[PDB]
Each structure stands twice: as C-alpha cells, then as structure tokens.
Amino acid sequence: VPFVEDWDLVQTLGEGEVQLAVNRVTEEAVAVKIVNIKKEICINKMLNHENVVKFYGHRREGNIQYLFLEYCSGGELFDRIEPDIGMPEPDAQRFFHQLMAGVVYLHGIGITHRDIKPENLLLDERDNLKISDFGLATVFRYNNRERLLNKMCGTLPYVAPELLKRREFHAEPVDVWSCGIVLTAMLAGELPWDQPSDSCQEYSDWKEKKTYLNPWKKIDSAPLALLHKILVENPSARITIPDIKKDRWYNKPLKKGAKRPRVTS
Ligand SMILES: N#Cc1cnc(NC(=O)Nc2ccc3cc(C(=O)O)ccc3c2)cn1
C-alpha cells in the first residue's frame, strides 16, 4: 500500500518534544517523542499492558531518536485534578485501580518506573489510565535476583523518604509511595509536602498524625486509612500492592460503569 508509512506532525503534546502524528493514509494518531534513551527504548520493547503506554517502534535519523508511542486523547491525569479540590472520589478510585494494575504489571516483569506523578499518567478516549515515560525507568529484577537501587531519581514531592535518607533501597516500595502521593493529589487537589524529610514541617505533621490539617482534612476516613498504610516512612513496614488490593476503600463500591446509551417505555 503506497504512502502508508507517512505521518504528518500536526501539534505539540509536551516537552526533547512530544508531537501528535497522523498517518497520511489510515489517519491513525500516534505520539512521537523526538530526543538513558537507549535504556528507554529497550525497556519500552519489553512492555505490553492495557494501563502502559504502547510502544510501536523507533527510528534514528543521525543524532535524533524518534519514539513512536501511544496517543492518549484524554491528556494527562494532572489536568483532571482541580487545584485545592481534586476530583470526585469514585473517579480517583477508578484511576487508582488502573494505576495499580499498571504498576503490578511492571513490577511483575521486574521494571520500576521511578517517576510516577499525574503528568506521567495519560488518559485514552475512554479515560483509561496509561503509565507514560520510561526515561527514568530501570530493571530491578533479573534472572529472579533483586537489585537494590541507589540512584536519586524522580520528582521531590513524589519521592519516598528512603531515597533521601538511605544509600540503598528496594525499588517496589518507592513506586508504591509515589502512587500514594498521586492518590493524595486526586482526593485533595494539593501535594502534602515539598519533600518527605524531617526538615519539612508538613511531613513532620503527618508523622505526628495531625490529619485535621490540609490536605488530609479534605479526604474521607476510608481512603485516608489507605494513605496511612502507603505513606509509612519505613519502606519495610509500608503496605505492598497485594495488600492495597485487600484495603477496605480499594474494594468499596462507589462508581457506575461507562455511561451506556438507553431508551425508555
Ligand atoms: N514519554 C512519553 C509519552 C508522552 N506522551 C505520550 N502520548 C500522548 O498522547 N501524549 C499526550 C500528552 C499530552 C496531551 C495533552 C492533551 C490536552 O492537554 O488536551 C491531549 C493529549 C495529550 C497527549 C506517550 N508517551
């Protein structure tokens, strides 16, 4: 079929730069990342899951790398969070379920994302969450042997406290912590602290269980009981994903399915 390989760059999606590309023949939309990168391509080739941004391929034009990735028309989860309000609790529970499925998948194949935040969680046309950007990602389990991490990666308001206090740490509780900060942002529309350190007053208040303060006072007791188990300073005592899936709020019926068309009489 002629011209089937031609794509037109129609608009900017993010910033390296991310462009929306449309196929000249089929009109299929893809996101093109125009660029660490060698590792991002290698990790992306391992990935295949409904809550993980799809990798279609790559092309190297001299010094420039072109990553052909899934287009998510709903944009970033970040723009679904109303500042200081958040979003309706049933929406946050659905986004959190899909975030857990995506992270379970990644950890299962021994990959840690290391930069989970709402800017990296994209939504398709049906508002299905997709974990995006594997530029900071790494392999923490190979040949069934766990590798402890030591590199400083992520975004300070979402990083686990052990990444700041310890030389080495396990990879999985770090992604669990950032998911908990994402859950906090979705339910309160604010970040609880700048960084999880003792020098940070907001972080000390949380360890002192002052939940009458913002953002915790905006969060219902059931999802807050979950946050009490995720945002635990000691990563060895922090709730694992199998146990998040057994939490009372995680399994609380709150939301109806996608609106489906119907007529009466
Ligand atoms: N790395 C990476 C990466 C970045 N973007 C990917 N896909 C994608 O569709 N990106 C975006 C990013 C921002 C967007 C923002 C909007 C919007 O603000 O309306 C709509 C669609 C968007 C789509 C896929 N992988």
Residue 70 annotated as binding? no
In the chain, where the domains are located: 1-82, 83-265
* Beta carbons within 8 Å of 167's beta carbon, 6+ residues apart: 150
Least Cα distance to 177 among 223, 117, 261, 130 occurs for 117
In angstroms, what CA-CA distances link 131 with 13, 77, 144, 199? Answer: 16, 10, 24, 31
Residue of 32, 40, 66, 72 best suited for mutating to test ligand 1, as the one with most atoms within 8 Å of CB = 72
Q: What residues pair up with 60 in beta bridges, in sequence order?
A: 65
**Catalytic annotation present for 115:** yes
How far apart are alpha carbons 53 and 45 in whole angstroms?
11
Which tokens sit at 161? Answer: 């406290």
Question: 39 alpha carbon to ligand 1 midpoint, in Å?
Answer: 21
Experimental method: X-ray
How far apart are alpha carbons 264 and 252 in whole angstroms?
30
Residue 148 annotated as binding? no
Question: 259 alpha carbon to ligand 1 midpoint, in Å?
Answer: 24
Residue 15 annotated as binding? yes
In angstroms, what CA-CA distances link 154 with 46, 56, 117, 229? Answer: 21, 25, 9, 21
3-state secondary structure the chain: CCCCCCEEEEEEEECCEEEEEEECCCCCEEEEEECCHHHHHHHHHHCCCCCECCEEEEEEECCEEEEEEECCCCEEHHHHCECCCECCHHHHHHHHHHHHHHHHHHHHCCEECCCCCHHHEEECCCCCEEECCCCCCEECEECCEECCECCCCCCHHHCCHHHHHCCCECCHHHHHHHHHHHHHHHHHCCCCCCCCCCCCHHHHHHHCCCCCCCCHHHCCHHHHHHHHHHCCCCCCCCCCHHHHCCCCCCCCCCCCCCCCCCCCC
* Beta carbons within 8 Å of 63's beta carbon, 6+ residues apart: none
How far apart are alpha carbons 147 and 144 in whole angstroms?
10
Residue 137 exposed, middle or buried by CB count within 10 Å (0-12, 13-18, 19+): buried
Give me the catalytic one of 79, 115, 198, 220: 115
Residue 20 backbone dihedrals phi, psi, to 5 degrees: -85, 125
Instruction: Yes or no: say if 154 and 114 are a contact pair by the CB < 8 Å rule.
Output: yes
Question: 76 alpha carbon to ligand 1 midpoint, in Å?
Answer: 7
Instruction: Yes or no: say if 15 and 7 are a contact pair by the CB < 8 Å rule.
Output: no
Strands 64-70 and 55-61: antiparallel
120: number of Cβ within 10 Å: 23
Residues with CB under 6 A from ligand 1: 13-14, 18, 31, 33, 53, 69-73, 75-76, 79, 122, 132-133
CATH of domain 83-265: 1.10.510.10
Whether the bond between 157 and the residue before it is cis, its omega within 30 degrees of 0, is no
Residue 17 annotated as binding? yes
Question: 66 alpha carbon to ligand 1 midpoint, in Å?
Answer: 15
Burial track 8-47 (b if 16+ CB lie within 10 A, e otherwise): eeeeebeeeebbbbbeeeeeeebbbbebeeeebbebbeeb
In angstroms, what CA-CA distances link 87 with 90, 129, 254? Answer: 9, 15, 13
Residues 35, 38, 41, 43: is their CA dihedral positive or negative? negative
Which tokens sit at 228? Answer: 């009490």
* Beta carbons within 8 Å of 184's beta carbon, 6+ residues apart: 190, 191, 192, 215, 219, 227, 231
The fold of the 1-82 domain, in CATH, is Phosphorylase Kinase; domain 1 (3.30.200)
Which tokens sit at 6? Answer: 């031609």
Least Cα distance to 131 among 78, 36, 54 occurs for 54
